[PDB]
């Protein structure tokens, strides 16, 4: 039963941010927000943009984005 194709599909499910047919809107959007914040911290001119728009320092913006990564979108249901 051990094929390459079922090994590929199982390794895809291990990559964080990947979903299946029982993924909820909450999970999908939490993934979206988390890698959005990581990408803002990676790209230097997007961070420059936000730091000019809200009149803050870049270290302060990075710290705020880090703090927002623990619970974006609020708490889950149930």
């Amino acid at each position: 039963r051990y094929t390459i194709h079922s090994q590929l599909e199982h390794l895809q499910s291990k990559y964080i941010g990947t979903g299946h047919a029982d993924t909820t809107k909450w999970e999908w959007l939490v993934n979206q927000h988390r890698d959005s914040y990581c990408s803002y911290m990676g790209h230097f001119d997007l961070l420059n943009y936000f730091a000019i728009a809200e009149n803050e320092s870049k270290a302060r913006v990075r710290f705020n984005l880090m703090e927002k990564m623990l619970q974006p979108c609020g708490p889950p249901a149930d």
Partner: protein, 70 residues
Amino acid sequence: HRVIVSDVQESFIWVRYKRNENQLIIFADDTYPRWVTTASLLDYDTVAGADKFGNICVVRLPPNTNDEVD
């Protein structure tokens, strides 16, 4: 009488002003979303735009475009 409007998340929208009926009418738009920061007109049918993420684009209306639609 042509108006190019930039949207925050969508690309450019094309608008015509009908003087005699006092109307602003949309006659074209784009198929991609763009976080537009700035735009410049190159000629009567061509816009250059820039994005929040670092891209430049040029968008052109096809020659068959009817400015007078509803």
